[PDB]
Amino acid sequence: AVEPITIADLTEVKLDGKGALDQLLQVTRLHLAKEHDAGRLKGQEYAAVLTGGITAVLQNAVMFLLQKDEAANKAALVEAQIKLTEKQGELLDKQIAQADKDAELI
Amino acid sequence: AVEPITIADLTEVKLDGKGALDQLLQVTRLHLAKEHDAGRLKGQEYAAVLTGGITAVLQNAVMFLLQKDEAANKAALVEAQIKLTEKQGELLDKQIAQADKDAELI
Mutation choice for A interface testing from B70, B92, B96 by most A CBs within 10 A: B70
Cα dist. B20→B13, B76, B101 in Å? Answer: 12, 25, 63
Which of A27, A79, A82 lies closest to B21 in CB terms?
A27
Rounded CA-CA distance A75/A70 in Å is: 9
Whether A92 sits inside 8 A of B87 (CB atoms) is yes
Resolution of the entry in angstroms: 3.1
Which H or E run contains A79? helix A45-102
Tell if the CB–CB gap between B7 and A28 is shorter than 8 Å: no
SS3 at position A38: coil
B32 min Cα distance to partner chain A (Å) = 13
d(CA A71, CA A77): 10
- The answer to whether the CB atoms of A30 and B13 lie below 8 A apart is yes
Our CA-based measurement puts residue B78 at a distance from the nearest CA of chain A, in whole angstroms, of 8
Contact B70, A74 (CB under 8 A): yes
Q: Are A27 and B21 in contact (CB under 8 A)?
A: yes
Residues from chain B contacting residue A20 (CB–CB below 8 Å) = 7
> Which method was used?
cryo-EM
Q: At what angle are helices B20-37 and A20-37 packed, to 10 degrees?
A: 20
- Please, what is the angle between helix A45-102 and helix B45-102, to 10°? 10
DSSP assignments along B29-65, one per residue = HHHHHHHHHTTT--TTHHHHHHHHHHHHHHHHHHHHH
Q: How far is A14 from chain B (nearest CA, A)?
A: 16
Cα B44 from Cα A35, distance rounded (Å)? 10
- Whether A24 and B58 have beta carbons less than 8 Å apart is answered as yes
| Separation CA A55–CA A61 (nearest Å) | 10
| Closest listed residue to residue B43, CA positions, set A32, A35, A33 | A35
A84: which residues sit within 8 A by CB, 6+ positions away? none
Say how far apart CA B57 and CA B66 lie, in whole Å. Answer: 15
Q: 3-state DSSP call for residue A106?
A: coil
